[PDB]
């Protein structure tokens, strides 16, 4: 089980968090598709905004740690993609 699968399972009781994670999942799928780069960036930006506030709202615990790790990774993926697009 990946960290992401586990985060999703810990989020089973929190629809807003699941939904933001699904938008992030769509971003990553778009990054793999021909012509998908701008859609990926838009999905990354939107999900990240939501996830940052959800992270601020999260009480301390394993789910917060997983969410922080995922947010850092998503931000880095989006940053790298943005640089690739800028060329």
């Amino acid at each position: 089980t990946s960290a992401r699968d586990l985060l999703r399972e810990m989020a089973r009781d929190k629809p807003r968090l699941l939904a933001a994670l699904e938008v992030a999942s769509a971003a990553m799928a778009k990054e793999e598709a021909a012509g998908g780069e701008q859609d990926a960036l838009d999905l990354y930006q939107h999900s990240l905004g939501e996830l940052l506030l959800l992270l601020a709202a999260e009480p301390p615990g394993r789910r917060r740690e997983l969410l922080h790790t995922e947010v850092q990774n998503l931000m880095a993926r989006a940053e790298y993609l943005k640089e690739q697009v800028k060329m």
């Binding site: 990240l48 905004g49 601020a56 947010v71 931000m75």
Partner: peptide, 16 residues
């Protein structure tokens, strides 16, 4: 400790 200052800076930069 989460560095929200770093994350908020990076987020504004990304958004453009």
């Amino acid at each position: 400790d989460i560095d929200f200052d770093d994350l908020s800076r990076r987020f504004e930069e990304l958004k453009k």
